[PDB]
Symmetry: D3
Subunit: 148 residues, 6 copies
């Protein structure tokens, strides 16, 4: 009966050192008109590239694909929790021509909320966490969209 | 609870001169068994290519991605309105080898109806309009499908 | 209100001779909290490759894309029926360099069931059948997933 | 010591029925300043596509890659003979969606001449023949270029 | 009988405003042991990208493919002249999503020299000029390589 | 004045452990009619893939691109030496989804001979050696071809 589609800026940060990996998030939620329980799917992508004067180049990409239950608390607030899979791809080119690329999948989970300040508008805020090998990647998301 | 999937022929026409740009549309609608309000997403794609004896070639493609509320009026009729984004890509090859390609996005909106002459069948008719720079693109769609 | 996502192993077998074509299936089902009728979409892909000492190589791929109604019988059992389209691609390289590739679409249908031994878990079992030219392809699927 | 590069129009014709398959040829020849014997390599590509009102579509492509000795007879005339490999790719889409593609290699040979009406100019005329399965493909070529 | 292969840095500059477009050049020359006249082919590629704080992005690429006679003056010096074709591709993305891409071919010519300070070593210096529409692109090249 | 084109089987072996990496080589040589010194360019490619019951997969590819002087000793024998660059790409997928890919370039050199048992035929035998990081890759080649 109702769908909400939001998009915004996402920012990841891993165990200390990889700095801030920037990007975006999209979410699609569905609700019934006569039940407070629905579902929400999320797509997050962040990245960062570090080049140089030397020549050494490195590029990190993070993908987060999650889904879970969403619960409407009142006409202007809802909360949700999501689980799924995180994917990271690290590229490194060591001057002048050595190239080494590694990728792996890991478990991902998250939780968020949505507010409806106007009935057809949504403000979305969530946090997502992924493990991937032994590196804990945490991402914060602030989005906006429409409920139709 | 119910979904309806329809597909058909789409035909676009822009501010006068680009002639008839032909193609297709697909829509996916979802309804609850106990609410008349649901949602519908639409995908439209049209195109046209003009070649020659000279050599000058041009190709225009239009993409329309929209979504919105659908309201069931009775067992055989429903109406919906959609909003989203239109995308146009104009290619021109000026003989013998000059190539110039331009693309942009714009706001899109539309409205339609669906009839169910039999309970598991749907007849879909809609009109979509996109702006894209200063060119108003209007597309008419007639589709058929199944409700399951 | 509820979604169930399952994945598993799929195994196809065609009119006698193509042996067992192995692969996978994914399904996405949606249910309302206050109606036993919902919908389920299915994606199946199987394949097989036969090489040699001689050199003759052949590769067969099968894709099945179906959707239909799902009906919840009680808290732990549901049944569904699906219809859609099957696609097959047969590749053959006759030594030392002749290559012949053929592909076509046909009608597909299937039926299955799902059990929920725990409320957020699903066990999925279905059978899918496709025609494609004059070759009847039948595929068996056993999957597992989560309901959220 | 000297090179000649020519390009022109090529036209193939196979055992009767495939009509005229149109396209192009490029050749690169090399000569020594103090020997009349040199070498020449050739690249030929032709094609034809037949569409419809019905829907049946077919596309034929021919590639010819050959090389051999070139002999300069006087300051304005040379003759050459080439051998190598021909490649043909036949595509057929039988309405509404059956697709069948076949390709194979075969022996190719050819012979030609070049005239130099001015010392830095060349006029090239050759004929190429390929077998490929049991289909004899014969191609005529008329090119022009520069000797530097 | 002898070949020389050199590579180096290339830098283009067009009618005033496009600044310095950086890149590389490769050349392959061939000589006979008993004639001072031979041939040389050249491949040049340069580029430049300008991004921003605003968002407007532009990317210019230049390709130069030329060939011509090379004349050995003594054991350590040779001169050559080349002619061929220049290709330029200008990309521009006007924020937030307008994209306009244009490309064309034009005549190219150049001239250079090579020194052999040691018999198996070469130092290459040349200048290339291309027109392309009405924009005169001039490129300077300094390369090094081996004669074998 | 004369060219010789040969192709054959190549087999690489690295410092002990990577076993036998199989593949091919192509060479193009050019000779003048009145000098025993000419040039020859070589392209070598070998590979090996190791899969499993477990799931761990690894794939190694080796590319060798070399060129150098060729000297004709008599009407039936010639010797040559080549230098250039070797490239290796090692892929490893650690079950169930970790992927790690590394590539680098290194110096390559080789030496060979060619016999002409008949004037338009050639038998080619060479050995190529590449370093690439700290791994010494040695490849043996036996080819056949035509002199025209």
């Amino acid at each position: 009966a109702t769908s909400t589609v939001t998009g915004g800026y996402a920012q990841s940060d891993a165990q200390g050192q990889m700095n801030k990996m920037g990007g975006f998030n999209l979410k699609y939620r569905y609700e019934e008109d006569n039940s407070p329980l629905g579902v929400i799917g999320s797509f997050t992508y962040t990245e960062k590239s570090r080049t140089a004067s030397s020549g050494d180049y490195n590029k990190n990409q993070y993908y987060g694909i999650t889904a879970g239950p969403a619960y409407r608390i009142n006409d202007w607030a809802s909360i949700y929790g999501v689980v799924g899979v995180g994917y990271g791809k690290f590229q490194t080119t060591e001057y002048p021509t050595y190239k080494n690329d590694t990728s792996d999948y890991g478990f991902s989970y998250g939780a968020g909320l949505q507010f409806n300040p106007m009935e057809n508008v949504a403000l979305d805020f969530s946090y997502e966490q992924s493990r991937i090998r032994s590196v804990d990647v945490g991402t914060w998301i602030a989005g906006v969209g429409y409920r139709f």
